[PDB]
Structure formats: C-alpha cells, structure tokens
C-alpha cells in the first residue's frame, strides 16, 4: 500500500468520497514526488557503498555475530539482507508511507530472525550503521524522511 491507498481505504470504510482533508494530504504528497524520486535514486546507486561501509563499522562495533564467524554464506546472507532493507526503505520513500517496508520486511521480522537464531539487538545495531552511511550521502531535508524508515525497522526489532 501507500499514502494514496490509505486515504482511499479510509473513505471506503465510511462509505463516502474523499474528504477535503484527504484531498489536501494527497495534493501535498504528490507535490513532493520529484524529491522522493531523487532520494530513492541515491539509495539505489549507493547500495554497495552503504552496505560495505556499514558492514565495516558494524562488525567493528559487534565482533560476536553470525555474519562475522568466519562463515561465508552466513556473511553473504547478512550482506544480502542489508541490501534488501535498503530496497524496502527506498520503496517506502516513494510510497510516502512505511506500508511497503511493513508488508515486505517488518511484519514477521522477530519470528523469522528468531527462527534463524540471529540476535535481534545485533540487527538493530547494524541498522544504525546502515542508517548513518545513508544519511551522509544526502541533504539535511532528504535525511528526515529516510531517518524515520530506518527508525521503523529498529522499532519493530525490539
């Protein structure tokens, strides 16, 4: 879903047309479209930079972790996940909501990682590392939106 979907489904539940408030939200949202796309492009072209620089800070911060146990596959797996969370965050920025991130990445996160036997706090940590890298690649304003999505993932992991 997206901000647009949320507005529509709201009206749907009251069996009516969009209200003045729902229309204004929509107009303010689409007005920020070009900027949103600029941000998502940043993330796209800097996936490897963010992941590798963040992995690097992360592992220094946390040496006891299953991606740093001299196990490739495990290391590869964790690096892949970081890339996926970037992709999801980028989708969320475009969508104007954490819905994309929620549906694809957040709902079930504790159950999956718990099953895989990966400590949750370590994932939170790595998210901080990834968060920093990405913020640095972008303006002050651009950083606001993106920050909250990274925060969201970290919220759901605790």
């Amino acid at each position: 879903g997206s901000i647009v979907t949320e507005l529509i489904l709201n009206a749907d539940s009251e069996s009516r047309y969009p209200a003045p408030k729902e229309i204004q939200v929509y107009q303010n949202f689409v007005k920020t479209g070009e900027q949103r796309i600029r941000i998502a492009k940043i993330l796209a072209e800097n996936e490897q930079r963010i992941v590798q620089n963040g992995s690097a800070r992360f592992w220094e911060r946390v040496p006891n972790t299953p991606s740093n146990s001299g196990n490739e596959r495990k290391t590869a797996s964790c690096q892949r996940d970081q890339g996926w969370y970037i992709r999801l965050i980028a989708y969320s920025v475009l969508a104007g909501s954490e819905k994309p991130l929620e549906e694809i990445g957040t709902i079930g996160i504790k159950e999956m990682y718990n099953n895989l036997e990966i400590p949750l706090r370590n994932i939170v940590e790595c998210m901080r590392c990834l968060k920093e890298e990405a913020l640095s690649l972008m303006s002050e304003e651009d950083a606001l939106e993106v920050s909250a999505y990274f925060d969201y993932v970290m919220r759901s992991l605790s």
């Binding site: 879903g1 647009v4 529509i8 009206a11 689409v30 989708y91």
Partner: protein, 162 residues
Amino acid sequence: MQDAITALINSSDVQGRYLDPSSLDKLQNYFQSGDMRAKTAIAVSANAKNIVTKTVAKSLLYTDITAPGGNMYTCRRYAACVRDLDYFLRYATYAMLAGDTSILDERILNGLRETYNSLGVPIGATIRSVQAMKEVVTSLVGADAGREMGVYFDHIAAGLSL
C-alpha cells in the same frame, strides 16, 4: 488494494530489483496527474446524485425492466439498482485517483457476474447504464478527464461480459 505506485513497487519486488528507469518516471507521470485526479474526484463528489439521475434517465427508464415483473420494478429494486450505480461511480473514482483498476476487481467485480445471474439482474442493461455513466461524466469534466474516468468505467463493463 494496489495503486499506481504499489503496482510498480510490487513488479520490482518480485525480481528483487530497485525501481527501473521506466518504472520511475511512470511514477513521475502519475505524480504529475494528481492535480487533475483531485480535480476530477472533487467534481464527481459534488455531482454524484445528479450523475446517477441522468444515467438512469438515459439507459433504464421507459423500458421493460421498470414494468411489472421487471428487475427494477418495486421501489426497493429500483432503489437497489440506484445504490449499485452509486457504488460503480464511487469506486471508479477511487480507482481513477489510485490510477489502478485493481480496486474494481476486488471490491466491485469479485462475484458480481455470478450474483447478478443468481438474482435475475439483467447484465446487458447494466453494461448499457455503465456506458451512459461514462458519457454523463465526460460531459461534466471534459474529454481530457473523461477518457481517464472512462478507462475505469470500461473496466467494470468489461468484467460483466466475461
């Protein structure tokens, strides 16, 4: 439901990819259309009862369906019919705003062909009335926005034929 954005996100997500150059900008296309979409939804919202009145007048009245034994005979059945046209208009507006037809497939056409046949609701008359709604709305918003709402109306009509 899925919107113009959600759709592009989902087509990307199944191949594990970031939005591609064409998925982007199709997005720009959409974001640019929002004003017209908000304009259209506002106007339809303010002429909703009026649109269905004209729609009914041009396709369903003075026919065998409003005669005793007809499916639109009995004020209850007449009112049911008008309620369904209310639903087509509102949901087509939701769709247009979303820029995706998916909401029609899931909230309007799910079991409708089947439900109608079960109840004896004439399908050819219903399609006729949907094509009138198209024109009535085009007469209210112009051909430019009329084409857009048209696509959603055509969708509903098409999904009754099957």
